Amino acid sequence: SSQIRQNYSTEVEAAVNRLVNLYLRASYTYLSLGFYFDRDDVALEGVCHFFRELAEEKREGAERLLKMQNQRGGRALFQDLQKPSQDEWGTTLDAMKAAIVLEKSLNQALLDLHALGSAQADPHLCDFLESHFLDEEVKLIKKMGDHLTNIQRLVGSQAGLGEYLFERLTLKHD
Amino acid sequence: SSQIRQNYSTEVEAAVNRLVNLYLRASYTYLSLGFYFDRDDVALEGVCHFFRELAEEKREGAERLLKMQNQRGGRALFQDLQKPSQDEWGTTLDAMKAAIVLEKSLNQALLDLHALGSAQADPHLCDFLESHFLDEEVKLIKKMGDHLTNIQRLVGSQAGLGEYLFERLTLKHD
Amino acid sequence: SSQIRQNYSTEVEAAVNRLVNLYLRASYTYLSLGFYFDRDDVALEGVCHFFRELAEEKREGAERLLKMQNQRGGRALFQDLQKPSQDEWGTTLDAMKAAIVLEKSLNQALLDLHALGSAQADPHLCDFLESHFLDEEVKLIKKMGDHLTNIQRLVGSQAGLGEYLFERLTLKHD
Amino acid sequence: SSQIRQNYSTEVEAAVNRLVNLYLRASYTYLSLGFYFDRDDVALEGVCHFFRELAEEKREGAERLLKMQNQRGGRALFQDLQKPSQDEWGTTLDAMKAAIVLEKSLNQALLDLHALGSAQADPHLCDFLESHFLDEEVKLIKKMGDHLTNIQRLVGSQAGLGEYLFERLTLKHD
Structure with a gap:
């Protein structure tokens, strides 16, 4: 295998590849979420920006994982990226609820990967996860x-008013 | 006693120690009030900041009193700090009402200490209170x-909306 | 419970609250230690400053723990703060010995909390402790x-001379 | 009397003149104390500077009192300035002890003047004393x-060494 690879199990390598697919799918979902709020009939600029910034951050999370895979001598394997679960995302409350379950899923996958790194006794992976993903x-x-x-x-x-003010005063002004 | 001590009664020294305990307890209450509004289910950042700034100011009020105690040749004696009277603080209206009675209590203790300094004919203490605490x-x-x-x-x-706007426009923007 | 809470046990939440009380009590002890060395009959400015800087740092340690508690969806519960174990602190040697046992206690509580986070398989808490408290x-x-x-x-x-020089040349000049 | 004078009793005017004489005598004592430590056989530069700075400050205290006397429409009357009580001032410990009783005397005279201003119901004098002399x-x-x-x-x-170090490290280096 790699001349570089040391203390890096095939279970962790496979799990890192599964987590890259998850971050890339998370990024794809946030792209969808961002452009929906850019629709002239939704038109909530602050919410669009909030999700497009998250799409970039999740894309960056996957690239970091891909860099770490190569550093450890693992091999990256890509899979099909499943389209987002919805085409229309409702209200800001609906989209924020969908985003938080999406994020708890990714955080569970991180936790599981860490358990695995602990079970495989791989301190560097655990170090890597703590430093860049967990907090x-x-x-x-x-x-x-x-x-x-x-x-x-x-x-x-007051629903319509409430949504506007939130976008205006928390997301466009905080 | 102190080689330094002049015109500084034991009644005032004891009262200054009681007032240090009160400011420190006031600081502890404001810490509690600040972190409650930092809860994900309360989430009113401006209100959290308003109370954490007061926690610092009350801590600073006690330290000033402790410096003055030493300057006059009095001896500081610390007591147990009673935990805040509540664990949960309700709404911003509820927390602001609790804060104003807390502040009237401290202001009454200052007034009482001043009366005492006047009764004991201690102009410097009266000067000290007027300059740093009364206004x-x-x-x-x-x-x-x-x-x-x-x-x-x-x-x-409109309650929910009202609270958000206040935090947004008076405490996060004034 | 919290919509936010994930992989955060009640044992760790309770232990984080116990550790906040310990840091706040440690801060209260250092306030006492600092103002004692500000007494006209003790008068060791450098030692007063050394302990008042530690009082601030321990207060800051508790606030960090309180922020982390909220971030994880735990609930902060405050208890009475026990007054410092002593009113007078003797000599710099006596106060430094008291400070080091105080610090070993806090470090033991950190170690115990980490063991618990490891036993509960909570990598983020372990990450949090390593990064901000352990070193x-x-x-x-x-x-x-x-x-x-x-x-x-x-x-x-030579005792009296020794104490003065230490305050003068290590604490007021290093 | 003065076209300016209002609510300014003859008892306070006389007491302000007595206090000017006391500050001027205090200044004269500190001049003596400063130049003694400038003697080649005493030679403690830091102690000389400590007392000559106090001589200036006490001279400035009297001038302020003289300005206030004129402002209130009182008339300044000067008396003979008694020479300092000693010609030689011993050791730094001896000179510092003499200085602290000198200062407690002046502070007692201030306290007495304030009592008088209170008894005469003269708020401005009391204000004047609190602001510039009492603290x-x-x-x-x-x-x-x-x-x-x-x-x-x-x-x-160790006496000789002790004195040198104090002058060197507290008065020439703090």
Whole structure:
């Protein structure tokens, strides 16, 4: 195999490839989510920007994983990227709820990969996950949580107005 | 006693120690109030910041009192700090009402300490209180009063929306 | 419970709350230690500054833990803060010895919390502890160790002079 | 009397004149104290500078009182300035002890003048004393207290060495 490869199991290599596919699919979902809010009949610029920034970040997460795969002497294998689960994404509350379950899925896959790295006794992979993925997932899910609380507060009172103000004052002005 | 101590009664020294405990407990309450509004299910960043800035200011008020105690030749004695009276703080209106009674308590303790300094004929303590505590308490209670009026105005109309706008436009934008 | 909470056990949440209480009590002890050395009859400015900087750092350690608690979807619960174990702290050697046992206690609590995070298989908490608490504790206990060696060296020869020089040349000039 | 004079009693005017004489005598004592430590057989430059800075400050205290006397429509009356109580001032410990009793005397005279201003119901004089004399006296006596503690610490161990180090490291280097 690789002249470079040391202490890097085939189970972790396969799992890193599965996680690349997940981040790339997560990126594809956020592209869809971003352009839906750019529709003239949805028209919530701040929400479009929030999801297109996440699409970039998830694409960057996969590339980092691909760099790490090569560094360890693993081989990247790509699979088909499943289209997003929805074509239309409803309201900001609906899209934020879909985004938080999407993020909990990715965070579960990270946790599982870490367990595996621990079971395989691979400290570098564990180091890699802690440093680049674990805390960012925790901060992003807390951000999305905060946003779901605010959207519910607003949309509980007056829906159309609530959505506009949130986009205007939290996403276009924070 | 102290080679330094002059015209500094044991009644004032004991009262200054009681007031340090009160400011430190006030700081502890504001820490609690600040982190509650940082909860993903409360999520009102501006309100969290408003209370964490007050926690710092009250901690600073106690340290000033501790410096003055040493300057006068009094001895600092610390007591247990009682945990905050509540774990959950409700709404911004509820937390602002709790904060204003907390502040009126501290201002009453300052007034009482001043009476005592006057009764003990201690002009420097009276000078110290006037210069660093009395006007700041009056300005802060007037600020909190203004905020309670605005929150009631907003929450009288549409509660969830009202709270968001207040945090957005008075505390995150003033 | 929290919409945010994932892989965050109640055992760790409870232990994080216990550790916040410990850092806040550690901060309260260092406040006491700092103001004692500010007494006109102790008068060791450098030692006062050394302990008041630690009081701030421990307060900051607790706030970080409180931020992490919210990020993970845990709930902060505050307890009474026990007053410092002493009112008077003796000599710099006595206060530095008290400070190092205080710090070993906190470092043991960190170690125990990490064991727990490992037993609960919580990589993010372990990541959090390693990055912000573990190395700082090790560097601070080594600093305190170095200072105890120097104070003993000085106070072994000529006590009053030794203490002054240490404050003058290590703490006011290093 | 003065076309300007309002609510300014003859008791306060006389007491302000007595306090000018005291500050001017305090300044004269500190001049003596400063030049003694400039003697080739005493030769403690830092101590000389410490007392000559106090001589200037006390001279400035009297001039402020003289300005306030004119502002209130009182008339300044000067008396003979008694020479300092000693010609030689011993050691730094001896000179610092003499300086602290000198300062407690002046602070007692300030306190007495304030009582009088309160008894005469003269708020401006009380304001004047609080703002310019009372806190500075309290900070200076605490500084002198701290210095007496350090000198005793040093001179308790090894006298000649102790004095040199104090002048070198607290007064020439703090």
